[PDB]
Amino acid sequence: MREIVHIQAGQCGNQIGAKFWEVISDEHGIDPTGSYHGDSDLQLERINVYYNEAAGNKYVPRAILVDLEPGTMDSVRSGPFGQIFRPDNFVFGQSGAGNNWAKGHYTEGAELVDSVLDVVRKESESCDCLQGFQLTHSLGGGTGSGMGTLLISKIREEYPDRIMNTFSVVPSPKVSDTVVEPYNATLSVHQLVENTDETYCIDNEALYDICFRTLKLTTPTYGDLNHLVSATMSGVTTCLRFPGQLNADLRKLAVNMVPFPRLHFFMPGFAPLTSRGSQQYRALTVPELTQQMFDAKNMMAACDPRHGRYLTVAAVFRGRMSMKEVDEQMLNVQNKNSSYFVEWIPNNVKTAVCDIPPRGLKMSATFIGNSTAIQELFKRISEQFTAMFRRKAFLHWYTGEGMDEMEFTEAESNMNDLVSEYQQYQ
Template structure:
């Protein structure tokens, strides 16, 4: 956790809003929370955090690398997930969460995967999806499972969570199934949500940025490297 995180984040965000097609937001705070609460690690290392990040990101790109019954590449994701060009910031999640080197001893079922997938505890961004609405959702399942069961469970969870799903976008939950599970697991699921609750992060970063920038705290590190104060104001 660096002191200048709000600066770095704000400078990056101003570019990400304009120039990227899809952005997966992974938050240090949420990763530490998962390590402490879910994985019960007392002193998580960067290795533990990276393990969570790699599990999630490899889940998102799994369809590019392996065969599956229903594949979704990144372009298809962008088409299905982004209702307006600037709303391309996704909240990722992964189930089942296991710590590095440990195995998941109990094989999860498809209903359990879908239920856990929508749980805020498994999200890698420190915002509560219950405080907003999902515009779109993508679920990528891995392992040997029946498409019929996946579709049934996804429909079931959509009905259960209907207050949290935007009703003006029809068919806003997309599913992909890849036959090859991750190493050490029978089946897993990766979640991507485009939710309005992500504004909580932007608001938090913006407040931290303002309070630091007002006092010009740590600004000399950046100006010393050739940056201009106007770049911060602009961002």
């Protein structure tokens, strides 16, 4: 009965959404033609949360794909598992943003947001009782950031009572990729403060460190990482689809995680992680999973956990387990590290268990932490902004398209507000 539609913006978002629908069609046991070849009865009774039926026993995935560059749309159309989308969904323009936030927010949005809003109105009208939407984009470029944030503000002023998820990557400390990065990054944070319930963050280089030292691969690729972001997404949404001994959908996690409205930036993690060679020797228990969970090496963000204090922890498990064990081990991890958690929040852990594991494993576990130390990341963003804002470099390209300096100052002011709000409770 609960219903979630999908909207993919940006290149990185389009690729990880292709991999998202890939792992969803592999978890739910269906075929790239849309036809059914599954085995169990559990995989069809909850299919209304991500798909829709059609005249002729055909299934449509519930997604809308937005961009401005038709090359990536040709890429997801030509490849495998590009058949299942409906051809009324592939909406784009012809111009492109060129990694410029002002053009994507103030010029191309006026041409595209009308059609996208009409189609998402029809699709949200097609469903019975909607829970929320989730988008995938980045925080570095021009198309994904600006078009996603504009769509999210329109969606918040349209539906004021539903949840939002955003699986968005954030900039890296060691090596950058784009020169115009901190401008659109700070402006995107300025919109995501206002228009979104919850948003997890990914850093690329921590994914590189995980894929190097723990997975032990010779050739790390973009798709592999995309699959790790995908496995996080599936392991978060895995309670709306299968029954369990203690279920927890997304609004329950939203009200368990944030204590305050503006403290809504999380860090995810996956478990268990082992390579091909070293696979057989160590076991698959709740001790090994809970040990591999709480580490600085498991964290999929460029932030050290033990430089700050955890506020909340939500651990969503998958498999067939034993409950008193995981509660006793949560008690053990709470008793071991007393300096690492908030003192006025007692029993800082939240536990969820679902039955059906991901196919190929006997057990799995997803971690979501809310720890304040990510202000350090905000520091190494916002200070950098001041450097460029000391010399006013690259600015007239944004300025000629209808944008002023005062909104840059107010967006930096809001970023200052959030980093000092993290700094107060520390």
